[PDB]
Amino acid sequence: MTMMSGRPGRVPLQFLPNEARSLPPPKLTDPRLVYMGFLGYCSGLIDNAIRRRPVVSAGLHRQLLYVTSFVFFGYYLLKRQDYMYALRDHDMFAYVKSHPEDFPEKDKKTYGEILEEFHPVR
């Protein structure tokens, strides 16, 4: 099953609709971005190790490019993910609003009027 492929108004290969510009962008200190940079740093260290170079000191420009590329991709990935979750919430709330018969708010009962069975432990 595909939930969102046929959602009306969806541009085939956009990756970032204009509506997404109404959402707050992720901060540059977002922990997910920090973890993506950490993944880039680990990639650089593994690159040094495989090539039989000093792991921590061999190429600083290469490691910098690794970290920068991972952060650069992660920013847009996070933007798209947040947009998709916002879309899901928007559609859910609109559907609940447009079908009140399927989502009734029934009368509230307090615990002084609800009979719950008691199971003793012995």
Binding site: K108, Y111, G112, E116, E117, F118, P120, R122
Partner: protein, 175 residues
């Protein structure tokens, strides 16, 4: 002394008889207790007096914390998490206070048993009755809730007991 309330922890008026010597021999107990007084009780008293003098020059206070009453679990809606949280905390505090009440009563019972000596079976009847009443009430409130107890399970237990009592009363009425 004045450290504790004498109504919460009562004691009898402490009647003790006066010495009635019947022998010309001296009492080794009196001589030994005079030596103990002069050799032990005075230096300790002086040390305590010095310590209390030092304490009096630095007098500061701490306070008993006061908790207001919040709605009980009976006044909480089924899924209202915040009211349930406050009610559950209040119920746990009440449970601890009830445990301490039982502890006070048990302390009274034990003290009376030691105090009355050979006459404890008759002279501790009132403390035994008080402990019986408190123990029955506490057992009705809290027994068999098990681990993972809560206010909701206590309420369910009370409702079950109330239903049984109401049915028994109505069946006895029809007699």
């Amino acid at each position: 002394p004045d450290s504790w309330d004498k109504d919460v922890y009562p004691e009898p008026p402490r009647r003790t008889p006066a010495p009635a010597p019947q022998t010309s021999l001296p009492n080794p107990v009196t001589y030994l207790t005079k030596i103990f007084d002069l050799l032990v009780d005075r230096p300790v008293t002086l040390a305590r007096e010095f310590i209390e003098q030092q304490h009096a020059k630095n007098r500061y206070y701490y306070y008993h914390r006061e908790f207001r009453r919040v709605p009980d679990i009976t006044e909480c809606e089924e899924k209202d998490i915040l009211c349930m949280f406050e009610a559950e905390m209040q119920w746990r505090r009440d449970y601890k206070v009830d445990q301490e009440i039982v502890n006070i009563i048990q302390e009274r019972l034990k003290a009376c048993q030691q105090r009355e000596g050979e006459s404890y079976r008759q002279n501790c009847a009132k403390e035994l009755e008080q402990f019986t009443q408190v123990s029955k009430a506490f057992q009705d409130r809290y027994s068999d809730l098990g681990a993972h107890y809560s206010a909701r399970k206590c309420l369910a237990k009370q409702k079950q007991r109330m239903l049984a009592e109401r049915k028994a009363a109505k069946e006895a009425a029809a007699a």
